[PDB]
Design a binder for this molecule. Structure first.
Ligand SMILES: *[B@@]1([O])O[C](C(=[C])C([O])=O)C2=[C][C]=[C][C]=C21
Length: 264
């Protein structure tokens, strides 16, 4: 992955103060945009998108998985678990927990689903099973958010994120119904209006998954975007920064996404 007109990204990164990672592919032409696309960045909550895909893939071998209710306890409710909290008294099905993890970044949902898959190691093995040799999840919520510089736990690269997102939403990794379901959850995300969506023309359909670690200026977003009349674009925008107290920026993520889309 290289880029002979990277100066715009380099200037945005200098203005940001941290590091920016971008990979975008036009699945119609094959054109791509890269900037630190091979470098490792904390996933933060963005792993929750791939977790839901892994659940859908398991439902292809276990009938009734998605409809299975889970009557979880109050002490499943880790900070920022808005759907899980609201539905504590009733429980939630696996599909609802997947939906909640994708579209609200529900943390309790995320840990409950990880447990059904064998933990972080099971999600990682799923990702290996589709050809992602970069992704690694090592820890549960909320510990995976530590985002320590140079720590490779719970990281991937923007290119591997994009390539995996492509396989699961547009390729054959998932069966057709499972695939539409995964795209539908992403299209209903509520957390990403100031990130990639803020760079996408209002008349383009978008699904996305955000992540925010809360430390070290570390946040991200990845998305599938359908330009009018065309095959879709897939992209991933990740940030990090060298000081614990460096603030992340949603505007930086949106700007970097806009540079990628303009370059395509
Ligand atoms: B996680 O990374 O994602 C959300 C979040 C702020 C987002 O969607 O950008 C979140 C909240 C609380 C803990 C972890 C996460």
């Amino acid at each position: 992955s290289t880029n002979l007109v990277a100066e715009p990204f380099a200037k945005l990164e200098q203005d940001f103060g941290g590091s920016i990672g971008v990979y975008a592919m036009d699945t119609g032409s094959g054109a791509t945009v890269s900037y630190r696309a091979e470098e490792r960045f904390p996933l933060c909550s963005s792993f929750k998108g791939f977790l839901a895909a892994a659940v859908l893939a398991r439902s292809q071998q276990q009938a009734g998985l998605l409809d299975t209710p889970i009557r979880y306890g109050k002490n499943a409710l880790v900070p920022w678990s808005p759907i899980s909290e609201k539905y504590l008294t009733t429980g939630m099905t696996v599909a609802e927990l997947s939906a909640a993890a994708v579209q609200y970044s529900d943390n309790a949902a995320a840990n409950l689903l990880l447990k059904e898959l064998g933990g972080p190691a099971g999600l990682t093995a799923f990702m290996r099973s589709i050809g992602d040799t970069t992704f690694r999840l090592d820890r549960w919520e909320l510990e995976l958010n530590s985002a320590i510089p140079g720590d490779a736990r719970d990281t991937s690269s923007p290119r591997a994120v994009t390539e995996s997102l492509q396989k699961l939403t547009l390729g054959s990794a998932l069966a057709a119904p499972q695939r539409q379901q995964f795209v539908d959850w992403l299209k209903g995300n509520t957390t990403g209006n100031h990130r990639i969506r803020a760079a996408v023309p209002a008349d383009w359909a978008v699904g996305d998954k955000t992540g925010t670690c809360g430390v070290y200026g570390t946040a991200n977003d990845y998305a599938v975007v359908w330009p009018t009349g065309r095959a879709p674009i897939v992209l991933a925008v990740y940030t990090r920064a060298p000081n614990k107290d460096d603030k992340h920026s949603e505007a930086v993520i949106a700007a970097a996404a806009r540079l990628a889309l303009e370059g395509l």
